[PDB]
Amino acid sequence: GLFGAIAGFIEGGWQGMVDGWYGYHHSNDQGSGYAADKESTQKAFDGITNKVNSVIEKMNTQFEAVGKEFSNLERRLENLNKKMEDGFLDVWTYNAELLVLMENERTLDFHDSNVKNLYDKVRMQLRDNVKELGNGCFEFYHKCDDECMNSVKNGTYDYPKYEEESKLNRNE
Amino acid sequence: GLFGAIAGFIEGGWQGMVDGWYGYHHSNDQGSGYAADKESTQKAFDGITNKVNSVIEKMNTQFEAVGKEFSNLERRLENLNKKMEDGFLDVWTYNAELLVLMENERTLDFHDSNVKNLYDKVRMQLRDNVKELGNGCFEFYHKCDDECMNSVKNGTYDYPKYEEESKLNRN
Amino acid sequence: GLFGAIAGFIEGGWQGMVDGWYGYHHSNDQGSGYAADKESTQKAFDGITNKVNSVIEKMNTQFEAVGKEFSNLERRLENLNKKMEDGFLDVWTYNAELLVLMENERTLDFHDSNVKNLYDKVRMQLRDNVKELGNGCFCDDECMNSVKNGTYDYPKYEEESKLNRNE
Amino acid sequence: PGDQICIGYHANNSTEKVDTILERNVTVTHAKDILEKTHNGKLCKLNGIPPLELGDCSIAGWLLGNPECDRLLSVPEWSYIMEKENPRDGLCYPGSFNDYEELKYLLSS
Amino acid sequence: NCETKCQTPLGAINTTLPFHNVHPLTIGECPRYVKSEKLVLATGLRNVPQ
Ligand SMILES: *[C@@H]1O[C@H](CO)[C@@H](O)[C@H](O)[C@H]1NC(C)=O
């Protein structure tokens, strides 16, 4: 991508991830499951709706088309009219097409950056208690129950609690 | 936000940091110190001013509508005039506003990128003589003076000086 | 600049790197070697050519100028012709100028992000078998030329490099 | 523990909200209004030279010389003209002015 | 008894902003009229409290 997360170090996404746009896949001693993240999904939803609402509001019930008729000695004036309506037709088309292309691209990248930002947040939370596999997964140096997992997902990972255990497992 | 420094891993701002936009806070023995980076803040000022100057320089044409008056027998002409003035009006409104929206985004993202890049400059300079806590601070594995600090903030850090020392204190 | 690689942690360019835009420099025993990455440099080319083709294809929804003439008794009408043509002249100028600028900026950061993603690819590949110097630098003309096509057996060199690391 | 360096950015007391495409009401350190919405409400001179105040006279009323517009019999440079909407004093003797809107245009140069 | 370089029907204008929203019918050297209530340009960063 541009942030290199989507179709980058994380090669493809999860058809089993359905409850949101971004999130987790854990596999510990208890369970094994996909679970989407609340905050990053809501924030991106909030973002994109604001984006599309800010698209349907910027070209709105104004620039009109009264028709006009002209004689056969008003050929200049007739043309002048054509060139003006076509002119502004061309302009608004170009504006709309460009708008769509640009905002698309920025949308894609927005997701990309969003994902990375998630990975980076969990990463810099876990530190060296875990192993960076390079695939967008972390291999725990300790044991993480359906609880230590929930302590990661909501940004409440106690590093010092599992610090020494992961250490003893790491130097070995 | 997009680069995730601002309102991200560096959770909040520094109301005491007021000599610039970005910068440092060293907390050694000799003292503490909010102290702004020079290079990054300057470059960020130069970019932004360059930007708004490039915004006021883009919508500066003229002159008048020359203002015309029409008969009760030329009402298509009068409307054509009207349609073309409102027409241009709407175009220049959209253009001005969208430009505003877009360059606002890109501006905030620019600060974000700026901060991150800085933190990445410091991190890749220090290397493993420190603990990347991830609140946006570093914890040293050695003694860093108002002299070793004020050597990091100007790009110069003898890694293999403190290498063995920090390797020892690390283990 | 925005991604921090170009004129950033990779301080400067390589005037001998001339088989592509980006790429590597390996320096083991067997030799040295400026050697451009393929994938990333090809993908940049496609996206840049796709962009300028996408700019030439957007200002061709065009025109042929029918040029009118008016008496000394139709002056408002002449001005209305004038003002219209000048008005659209100004609009297409703006769009054109503005597009150039913005797509200039985005091209630059596109390269930046390209290079940084490359470096991040090699970095998350090697893992801790190397020193991440942070000048943008970090094995046979065979182990090298294995990394530069995405293939690197980490648990091969794992125990050897763990050894040489600690002494 | 640690000797320690930190990386951070400015914040302040600024309540100046701006908008972007993704967001609204976004509070920032530094902004710049680039759209003027204030005048004085007075009608002034312009590059020093004062406009031509027609008052209760129309352009014909002036150009012909309706006696109620006798002030206008001699007139210095103007920078622009201020004519009212339906000026009282125009064609005293009633009638018509041919191609008036084009004369009215000619005066604008 | 005043003075200006930009002149609306409703008032007169000193500014160096690149836009106004007063009246379209201006005379003299003026900023570009727009139908906007606001145009605010972010120059600084986000104000996030600690
Ligand atoms: C914000 O800070 C400035 C000084 O930098 C001060 O002048 C102002 O009073 C402060 N705002 C308020 C209302 O506290």
TrEMBL record, chain B:
<comment type="subunit">
    <text>Homotrimer of disulfide-linked HA1-HA2.</text>
</comment>
<comment type="function">
    <text>Binds to sialic acid-containing receptors on the cell surface, bringing about the attachment of the virus particle to the cell. This attachment induces virion internalization of about two third of the virus particles through clathrin-dependent endocytosis and about one third through a clathrin- and caveolin-independent pathway. Plays a major role in the determination of host range restriction and virulence. Class I viral fusion protein.</text>
</comment>
<feature type="coiled-coil region">
    <location>
        <begin position="56"/>
        <end position="90"/>
    </location>
</feature>
<comment type="similarity">
    <text>Belongs to the influenza viruses hemagglutinin family.</text>
</comment>
<protein>
    <recommendedName>
        <fullName>Hemagglutinin</fullName>
    </recommendedName>
</protein>
<comment type="function">
    <text>Binds to sialic acid-containing receptors on the cell surface, bringing about the attachment of the virus particle to the cell. This attachment induces virion internalization either through clathrin-dependent endocytosis or through clathrin- and caveolin-independent pathway. Plays a major role in the determination of host range restriction and virulence. Class I viral fusion protein. Responsible for penetration of the virus into the cell cytoplasm by mediating the fusion of the membrane of the endocytosed virus particle with the endosomal membrane.</text>
</comment>
<feature type="disulfide bond">
    <location>
        <begin position="144"/>
        <end position="148"/>
    </location>
</feature>
